[PDB]
């Protein structure tokens, strides 16, 4: 979800946490 972590669901743009 466009941050930094290895998965988001919107590819691996990085989940928000």
Tell me how far apart the alpha carbons of residues 14 and 4 are, in angstroms, rounded to a whole number.
4
H or E segment to which residue 7 belongs: none
* Method by which the coordinates were obtained: NMR
Tell me how far apart the alpha carbons of residues 16 and 13 are, in angstroms, rounded to a whole number.
10
Helix, strand, coil share (%) of the chain residues, nearest 5: 0, 10, 90
Distance of CA 12 to the CA centre of its chain: 5
Close Cβ partners of 11 (under 8 Å, ≥ 6 residues apart): none
Close Cβ partners of 3 (under 8 Å, ≥ 6 residues apart): 13, 14, 15, 16
Contacts of residues 7-11 at CB distance under 8 Å and 24 or more positions apart, as own/partner, are: none
Tell me how far apart the alpha carbons of residues 6 and 4 are, in angstroms, rounded to a whole number.
7
User: Partners of 11 in the beta sheet?
Assistant: 9
């Amino acid at each position: 979800s466009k941050k930094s972590k290895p998965g988001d669901g919107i590819r691996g743009k990085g989940v928000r946490g």
